[PDB]
Design a protein around this ligand. Structure first.
Ligand SMILES: *[C@@H]1O[C@H](CO)[C@@H](O[C@@H]2O[C@H](CO)[C@@H](O)[C@H](O)[C@H]2NC(C)=O)[C@H](O)[C@H]1NC(C)=O
Ligand SMILES: *[C@@H]1O[C@H](CO)[C@@H](O)[C@H](O)[C@H]1NC(C)=O
Ligand SMILES: *[C@@H]1O[C@H](CO)[C@@H](O)[C@H](O)[C@H]1NC(C)=O
Ligand SMILES: *[C@@H]1O[C@H](CO)[C@@H](O)[C@H](O)[C@H]1NC(C)=O
Ligand SMILES: *[C@@H]1O[C@H](CO)[C@@H](O)[C@H](O)[C@H]1NC(C)=O
Length: 188
């Protein structure tokens, strides 16, 4: 909705250079290519829609976004075990109510046959590292802090995500999240 230089924020000066040098641990020069985030990000019961994207990056304020796929879809909800802000819901179902998901209690949200995984957003890096997701029809990569985790799942991803940025009060009404979707093969 509104563009923002992501490197001009506080604590986000080196959140990108710390990401392009994750795997390059040698001395010298090299040109790399991939779905790498750019400098201009997007700070903006509200919804946002990204289409034709291959990766999704972003940087206790709550956020929610749903990655569409068949026959399994992914829900990431950052808001209950102690110091476990984030939740991953591997929904095998189709359309899901994004309001009843957040308004209801955390004890019964991702229930039924849907897999629930509570993960700890590290509240000690002061939001100075990129959080991200990347997917193809064979592998799903998650970037949290400075490490990459892989999952092997055979899915049919639709390359679009649904994002919730505004709602009424596990949800505190605030806007402290920047996000971006990557669709082109960028070189650094
Ligand atoms: C994400 O993309 C998928 C795949 O294109 C969309 O699913 C199709 O949506 C169209 C309308 O745009 C329907 O006519 C098709 O029947 C849908 N196909 C399937 C297999 O579901 C989906 O709507 C997109 N979602 C968002 C939120 O943009
Ligand atoms: C980013 O900063 C440059 C100057 O460094 C400015 O011209 C540009 O408009 C900014 N882009 C934004 C705010 O989207
Ligand atoms: C995060 O901020 C705290 C509070 O100022 C500081 O003690 C800590 O070292 C910071 N962590 C970093 C810079 O990795
Ligand atoms: C995004 O912009 C809004 C509206 O101007 C502002 O309140 C908010 O602080 C910005 N968010 C960040 C993380 O900079
Ligand atoms: C991706 O690059 C093409 C040219 O290769 C350009 O036309 C298109 O607008 C780019 N897409 C985005 C989302 O920036």
């Amino acid at each position: 909705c509104r563009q923002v230089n992501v490197t001009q924020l506080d604590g986000n000066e080196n959140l990108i250079r710390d990401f392009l040098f994750q795997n390059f641990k040698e001395e010298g020069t090299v040109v790399v290519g991939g779905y790498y985030p750019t400098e201009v990000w997007y700070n903006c019961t509200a919804y946002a829609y990204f289409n034709n994207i291959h990766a999704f990056y972003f940087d206790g304020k709550p956020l929610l976004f749903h990655v569409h796929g068949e026959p399994v879809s992914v829900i990431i909800y950052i808001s209950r075990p102690l110091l476990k802000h984030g939740l991953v819901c591997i929904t095998k179902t189709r359309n899901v109510d994004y309001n009843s998901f957040t308004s209801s209690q955390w004890n019964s949200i991702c229930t039924g046959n849907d897999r629930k995984v509570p993960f700890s957003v590290i509240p000690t890096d002061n939001g100075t590292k990129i959080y991200g997701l990347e997917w193809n029809d064979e592998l799903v990569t998650a970037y949290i802090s400075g490490r990459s985790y892989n999952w092997n799942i055979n899915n049919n991803w639709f390359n679009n995500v649904t994002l919730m940025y505004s709602r009424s009060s596990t949800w505190l009404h605030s806007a402290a999240y920047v996000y971006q979707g990557v669709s082109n093969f960028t070189y650094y």
